[PDB]
Amino acid sequence: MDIHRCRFVRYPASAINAVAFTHSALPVVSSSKKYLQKNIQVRLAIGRANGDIEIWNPLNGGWYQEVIIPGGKDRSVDGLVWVTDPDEEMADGKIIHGKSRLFSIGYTTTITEWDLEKARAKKHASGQHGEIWCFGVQPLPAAQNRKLVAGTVDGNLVLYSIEDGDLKFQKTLTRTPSKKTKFVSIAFQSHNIVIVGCSNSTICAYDVRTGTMLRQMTLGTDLTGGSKNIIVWAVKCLPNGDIVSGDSTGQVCIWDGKTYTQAQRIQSHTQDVLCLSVSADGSKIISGGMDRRTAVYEPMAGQSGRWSKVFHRRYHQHDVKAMASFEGKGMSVVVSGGSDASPIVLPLRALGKEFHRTLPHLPQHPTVLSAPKARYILSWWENEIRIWHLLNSAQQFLPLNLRKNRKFLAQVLIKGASHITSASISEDGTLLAASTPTDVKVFHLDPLYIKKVNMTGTGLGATRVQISPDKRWICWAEEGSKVMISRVHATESADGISYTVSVPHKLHRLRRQIPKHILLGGLGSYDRNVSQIAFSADSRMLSVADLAGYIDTWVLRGPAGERWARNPKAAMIPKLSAAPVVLSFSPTPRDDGDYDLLVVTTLKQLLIFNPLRGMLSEWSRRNTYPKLPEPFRDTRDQVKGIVWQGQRAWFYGVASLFMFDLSQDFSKRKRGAHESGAGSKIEKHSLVPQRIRAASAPDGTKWEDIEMVDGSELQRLREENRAKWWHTYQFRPIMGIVPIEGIPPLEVALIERPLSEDDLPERYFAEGEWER
Amino acid sequence: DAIEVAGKVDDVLLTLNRLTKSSAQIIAYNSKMLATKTGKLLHTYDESPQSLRSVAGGRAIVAAAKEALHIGILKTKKLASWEELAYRFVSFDVPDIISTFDIRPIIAELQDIDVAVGGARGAIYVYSNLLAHLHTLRVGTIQPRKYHWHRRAVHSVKWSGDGNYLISGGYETVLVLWQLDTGRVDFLPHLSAAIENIVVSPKGSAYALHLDDNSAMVLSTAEMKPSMYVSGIQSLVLGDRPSKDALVRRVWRPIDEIASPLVATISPQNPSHMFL
Amino acid sequence: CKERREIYLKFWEVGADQSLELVTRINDAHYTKQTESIFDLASDPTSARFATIGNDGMVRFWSPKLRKRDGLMATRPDGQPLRSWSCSRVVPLPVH
Amino acid sequence: LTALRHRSALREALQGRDELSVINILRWAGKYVADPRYRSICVDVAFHLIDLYAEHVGGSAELATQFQQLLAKVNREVEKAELAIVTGGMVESLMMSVE
Amino acid sequence: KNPKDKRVGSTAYRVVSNGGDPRLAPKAKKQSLNLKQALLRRDRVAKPRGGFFV
Amino acid sequence: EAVRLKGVIAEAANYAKRARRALADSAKGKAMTVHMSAELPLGLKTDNKISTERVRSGGEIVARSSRQIGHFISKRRGIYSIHRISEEMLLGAAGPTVVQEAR
RNA sequence: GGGGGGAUGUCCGGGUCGCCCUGGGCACCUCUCCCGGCAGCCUUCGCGGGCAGCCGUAGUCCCGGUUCAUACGUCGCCGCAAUCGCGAGGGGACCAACGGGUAACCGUUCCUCCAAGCGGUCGCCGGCGAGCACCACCCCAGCCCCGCGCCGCCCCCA
C-alpha cells in the first residue's frame, strides 16, 4: 500500500462565532422514563465567520457533524439562538416536543431564521436601525406569544415577533439616550426583565413590557490600558436571579439582582472576557477570555454569593469566542468554539475530573476527491475548486523530484456569490459537477482546457451530487431531501467529445412509517435529507441514505429506455440505529449478481448488505458488533471515509487509520464507565482526589474506600452456518484519503491539515499582558 | 494541645513517630503519660509521613503524608474520660506533594475547617469546607481551589489574620498576599533571599519572617517596613531538613554540599568585627 | 567557560561606619593570551601594600598612589583626592 | 548584552528574530567587532547568530552579503590582531636591551 | 453590481434592485465588522505573523 | 593557513559525525530530515532525536508523552512525502520507508 | 558503548554445489552481562546497605499538546560635578566586501577627520513648581483608521 502525505492543500479554517444548543436542560427522569425522553431531538448549532452554520448531534458523547449550511462571500454569522416550544400533549396524552426554530444574524440590520429541511434561509426581517449585534428570545413564565429581542449598534432595542412560522419586526422598545451607547451583550433575567451590557461601561436593566429603564448598572475605568470606557462583553443571569457579567478588564462582576448592583468583583483573566456560560441549576460558571483562557467558578461555601475561581486553563490555541452549556439525558457538557476553529467539549459536571475533548476542525464529509485514472486530486472551499496532478508513481521514486512531482494544476472560479456545497467528478476526470444550493454546474476538461457544460431544469440548487462510473448518470440531492437524476449523453465529433444533459428526472423516495407526533415534534421532517449517495461500480444500482438512517435504493431497468426503478427489496432494507456515516458498494463483484453494500453508522456499527436480497451478507451475519476489535470500538473518532481493496476495506476517521480483511472473521478506554459526555476518566493528574480512604482500627490496619458521588443460540446458529486488521494513530489531522492508480497494489492520497499559527488569525497584545 | 481531661484542661503532646521509613504513627501523651512513657496510639498511616499540627482545642488534628492528608476528628464530645480518645480518620490524595499546610478553624465550638496545602510544584491548593465534607460510605465531591503563583517551591502558606487573606512565602524571594475575595494578588516582592518561614501574629498586626539566610524580621501588616530585625551568621549550612524544593527532581538538583572554606577575615582596628 | 571567565580585582576603601566604597577595579589582573586565574592575595603587615599571584607566573605588587594625571589633583566634592592603587612592582617567578 | 549573558539568556533573546531584525543585529555586531573593549561580547553574540540563523541564507541573499560582510571585517581583524603582536614583540623586546 | 443612477441634474433615474439576496443570506456591513474588531483590539498591537520571511 | 583549514575541517568532521548519526536513525525509520545531495546544506544542522524528557516550570523534569512526541513528529514531517507501508508492517513486523521532499 | 551469541540481506576464492560456510565486507532484529540516569519498599538518627525494579527511545480513546513571572511609596522644570555617546553638515581614503560591467568602472556597504547642535548615567549636605486633576460631565473642531457615494486621470472595446 503506497501513501502520499499531502499537507500542501491550504484548507482555510475560520473563526467560530456562535454556539447554540437546542435545549439547555431537560427535566430529569429515572431510567424507567428513558423511553419518554428518548425521542427528544437534541442538536447543536455552530456558526463560522465564513457564514458557515453547521448542525451537530452530541450523540451521547458521539459528536457527529451532520449538516453544513454554507454562506456566501462577505457573509458571516454572529449570534445563534434555537427556539424550542414546550411539549404539546395530544388528545390521547401523547406528547409532541416543541418544533425547534433556529435564528441567526448576519452582522446586519437583518435577522434571518433558518429552515433546516430545505436547509437554507427560511426568512429575513429588518427593522430600520443600525447593525444588530446581540439577541435572544423571551423565556417562558405566553404559551404561544414569544418574542425576539435584539440589540443593535445605535442603541434601539428592537422587538421582533415570531408566531406561527413568522418573523417580523414588531416594534422598537426604546433607544438609549446618547448615540455612542453601543450594545454588545443581551440576556434575560426573568420573563419581563432584560439585561443588556453596553459600550459606555454600563449594564442596563430594562423592563420590556412597558419598555422602561429599571436600572442603570455601571462599571468604572479600565485602569490597566487606556481607553477609559470599559466594555461589558457578555452577560448572563443565574437561575436564582443574580447577574454575572464579563467585561473588558477581564473582571467578572457579581451583581445582586434584586437591587441590581454589585456584590463581588472577581479578577479572572488578563485580557478581556469573551463569553460566559452557566449550569442550569446555577452552580457552575465558565468564563472565556481572549487570552486563550478558560476559568471555572463555584461558590465560596458559606457566606452568600461570594463566588470563586476554582481554577483556569489554557484550552484552545486562539481565543474562546463563544461557549454554551447543556445538561441532560446523562450528559452535562459545555462547548467552547473559538477562533482556532476547534470546538472543544468540556465536561461541565466532571470538571477537573474528566478530560476535555477537541473535535476536529475539519468537516465530517471529507471534502477531497480524485480521479485515479487521471491521477487528479482536488478539493474545494468557498468558491474556488483546486486540482493538482501527481504525474508519477511512488516506486519510480523508490526525492529531489518530489517538488516537480506535485503540481498546482487548476483552480476554477464559480460565478455569482454562493458558496459551494459539494462536487462530483468522472473517474477519468473529464467531467465535473458543482452543487450550490442555488445552482449546479457541469464542466468538461481536456489535458488544460475547460468548458462550462450547461444544466437545464435546475435553478434551485443542491447539496450533494454524484457522477456515475460509466459517466452516464448524474444524481443530485437538491433541497436535501429531493434527489433528482439526469442522463448525460456523450457525443463524439472530429474535435472531440462533448456532453449533453437530459432533463433532470425526479425519482421518488419511499413513504416510510413514522408517527405524526414524531413528524411534528422536534425538528420535524429534518432527517430526510440524504447524507450520502453511492453508485454501483457498474452504475447499475444506486443508493441514498438520509440523516434518519433510512436507506433507499434503486435499480436500473434498461430498455433511451434506461430508467431507474425502485428496488422491491428496499422495503426489506431496514433503518439503522443511528446516522449512516458511510455507505458504498464494493467494487469487487459478487458471484450471484448481487451487490455488497458496506455500511458504517456513527455508533461504530459495521455491516454490509445484499440489497437485491434486501438482507445482510452472511459475513455480516457472522461478525457482530462486540466481535469488532477494541481499537476500532473505543476510538470516538467519527469514521470519515473508507477506501476499498480487493478483500480489504481500510477505514479512516479524522485521526486513526484502519484496515480489515473482510474475507476473514474476528475473535485504555474502559467500557463499564458511566461518564459525562467528553472523553474518558483521568488517571493521573487531577485536582480531585480519586482515592479516599477511611480507617477504623487506630493501628491503621483496617481501611475503607469512601466513594465519591453527589445471544447464545443466535451465535450458536451463526457459528453453525460456518485475523487481518490493523490500526494506527500516527497521522493525526487527516482531512481526506482517496485512492489512486497508475489484494491489489494501490497508491493513495493522504491529506492532512495541521493547524498553524500562520493559518489562524493573528494575536493581539498591548504592552501590559505579554505572554510567556 | 490544651484539652479538657475531666474538667481540667492541660497539655497533651502529639508526636508522629516512625515504625518504618515508609510509615509512622501518632501517639498522644499527658504529662503523667509521659512520666510513665506510655502513650495513646491514635493513627498509624503509611506514606512517608511528613507532618502533624492541631486545631483549636483539640477537636481535630492533621498529618501530612506525601500525596495525602490525614485528618482527625475526635469521636466523642466533651472528653469525659481520658481513655475515649479515638479519632475517625479519613485520608485523601492531594494532587501534588505536600510541601506544607496551614489550618483555619470555623467557629464555643468548631463548626468547620478550611485547610490550605502548598506544594513544591509551584502551587497552593486550599480546601474549603472540610468538617461537613467529611463528617457524613459516600460523600459529595470535593475540589480544592488552585492558587498558582510560584515556579519553585512554596515554603510556607498561612491563613491570615481574619481569614480574608492567604499569605505565602517562597524561594523566588517574594511574599504574596492572595486576596481571596477577588481574584487579585498583592505582594511584597524583594527579599534578600528565600522566604523560608512565616507566622501570623496573635492579632493580625504582625508577620514574622524567618528569612532562609538565617535571619528574622517582624513586619507590621500593610506598612511593610520591618519593625524588627535579627540576623545570623549567614554562612553555608549542612541543613538538617534536606530541602523544600528538592522533592521533585529539579533540573539542577539541590544537594546540601560544601565545596570551599567560608571566605572570611577579622578586622584590625576593630577586633569585634569579622567580614565574611 | 574556562576561556570566558571574568576575573575582577576590586580595591575597596573602608568606611569606619562599616561601609565599603570602591576605589579601583582591575579587569585583567593577570594576563597571558587568556585571562589568568588568580591564585591568591596577601597584605603587607607593615604598609598599605597588597600582593597577587596568578596563573601567568607573575606576582604583582599593588600600592596606593594618587589619581593625578598632569599635576592637578582630582578630588571628591569635599576636596579629598581620589586615591587609586596600582601595580607598583612586577616579578616573574622561577619555574623548574 | 553583558547582562543578558550574565544571566544566561542570550539564546532566548536571540531565537525570536525575523529576517530584517537579523540583518540589523548582524550589521551592528559587524560594526563593533573591532573595538577590543567589548570584542568578547560581540563575537559571542555573533556565534549565536550563526548558530541560529544560518539556514535560510540560501533563501535570502541580502543577509548573505551581511554574512559575508561580517566575515569580511573579521578577515581584516585577525591581521590587526597579528600586526599588533608583530610589533607586540618589538616593544617588549626593546625592554630587555635597556638594562 | 447595481447600475448607478442617471441624473438629469434636477431629478435622478435609477433602477430598483433586490436581485442580490435571493434565498442565501444577507451580506455583512464590512464597516460594522471592522468596528467590532476595533472594539476587540482597542489599542493593542499584533505580534509578528510567522517567521523568517520577506 | 593551517589554522584556517583546521577550523574548516573540524566543522566538517563534527557535521559528518552528526550526519552519520542522523542517517542511521533515518534508516531506522525515526523519520527526521536528512540531506540527500552531494553538496553541503548551508545550515549544518542535524535535527536531533527528541529527548524523552521535558523541562516544565519551574525547574522540574518529567517524561515526555508518547502523544506529545507524536506531535513533534507531525511537526517534523515536511510538506510532501511518500510513506510506503509494507506487508510486514501490516503483519506488525517491519517499519516504513519514507521519502520527504528536500526542504 | 563494549564483550559476545541466535537470525535477516549482500559481493569477491568458492564448494559435490547446497543446507550455507569459512576468509574479507558487513547493516539490522533478538539474547546476554558491565554504562548512565531514574524511581519505590525494608534497613539504619544519619551515613550507608538490601530487595525486586524500570528507561536510554519514538506517532496517542480523549488527554499534562496543560500549570507557571516580582509591589507600592510623587510628578515636572532647570542647574552643577564627574563620565560617555550620537551627529546635521562639511571633508578624505579609496582598504575591503557585495551587485552589475571582461575590464575600464559604477553603485551600495565599510573605514576615517573636523564639526553646528544634541542626548544618556552616577553623585549632588543642587534648587524651583505643583501633587483627585493627564480625572467626572457636555459641546465643538482635528489626526490615524475604516465604510459608502461623487469626480479627476487612465482603460479598453466604440
Swiss-Prot record, chain F:
It is found in: Nucleus. This is Uncharacterized protein CTHT_0071780. It comes from Chaetomium thermophilum (strain DSM 1495 / CBS 144.50 / IMI 039719). The chain holds residues 828 to 930 of 930 of the full protein.
